[PDB]
Write a protein that binds this ligand. Structure first.
Ligand SMILES: Cc1cn(C[C@H](N)C(=O)O)c(=O)n(Cc2ccsc2C(=O)O)c1=O
Ligand SMILES: [Cl-]
Length: 251
């Protein structure tokens, strides 16, 4: 059985290789997730075929409860595994299974170095420094649905100063931090990627929430627990650390 692996283009997890050499099939791609999939394939002993998710979506449910993205590919048995920066969530576990996480992360703060700012609390209690998140993203949602005192205050601020505090996308938010007095609330993994490539930027404080990326499978898949096992082996043997360093480290 050659396993069909659904994934999504997302730097540095999955990218097309910068080459015009005759590369076909899986060889057309590179990235953290391709390296992970190669390790998993070697530990478990499976053949695989990477297919980009046709609709280019991660997987969310509509008003009717219909799914899309990588999640929908698993539900429909069009893919055996989803190997991507796909967050393990309560709603997704209702319809697919997941391995234990190969990466853990949490919302954090992206801002300039040299400022006395050291946490979310420092931001919340002031208005001189603008702060927000990508509009309608996972981070915005967290703040909007939160019942934690300080995050409700930060949300009230982000929403009332909506037109300006909430940006269109990560790229723009990064631009906003580099050119104005602004702090962007973003997923720690993305922040680490950006800070490695821009010495003027830094992460502020620790993690605000906590979640993990796991390999998705259809419910009942016999590969799920085997993938968890392989993930634990790779972590313990320092391989996930090396694979992260390979893709995240900058100049
Ligand atoms: C790599 C990656 C995947 N995803 C998709 C997410 N892990 C998911 O499984 O739906 C994501 O939402 N962010 C964070 C993100 C993207 C646009 S806004 C935003 C946020 O953190 O608000 C990411 O950085
Ligand atoms: Cl589990």
């Amino acid at each position: 059985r050659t396993l069909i692996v659904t994934t999504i283009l997302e730097e540095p997890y999955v990218m097309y290789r910068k080459s015009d050499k005759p590369l076909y099939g899986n060889d057309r791609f590179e990235g953290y997730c391709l390296d992970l999939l190669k390790e998993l394939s070697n530990i478990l002993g499976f053949l695989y075929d990477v297919k980009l998710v046709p609709d280019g979506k991660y997987g969310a449910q509509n008003d009717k409860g219909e799914w899309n993205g990588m999640v929908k590919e698993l539900i429909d048995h069009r893919a055996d595994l989803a190997v991507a920066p796909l967050t393990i969530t309560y709603v997704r576990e209702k319809v697919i299974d997941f391995s234990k996480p190969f990466m853990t992360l949490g919302i954090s703060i992206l801002y300039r170095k040299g400022t006395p700012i050291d946490s979310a609390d420092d931001l919340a209690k002031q208005t001189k420094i603008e702060y927000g998140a990508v509009r309608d993203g996972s981070t915005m949602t967290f703040f909007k649905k939160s019942k934690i005192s300080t995050y409700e205050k930060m949300w009230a601020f982000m929403s009332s100063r909506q037109q300006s505090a909430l940006v269109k996308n990560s790229d723009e938010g990064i631009q906003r931090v580099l050119t104005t007095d602004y702090a962007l609330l973003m997923e720690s993994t993305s922040i680490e990627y950006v800070t490695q490539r821009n010495c003027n930027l830094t992460q502020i404080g620790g993690l605000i929430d906590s979640k993990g990326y796991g390999v998705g499978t259809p419910i009942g898949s016999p590969y799920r627990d085997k993938i968890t096992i392989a993930i634990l082996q790779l972590q313990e043997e320092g391989k996930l650390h090396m694979m992260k360093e390979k893709w995240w480290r900058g100049n």
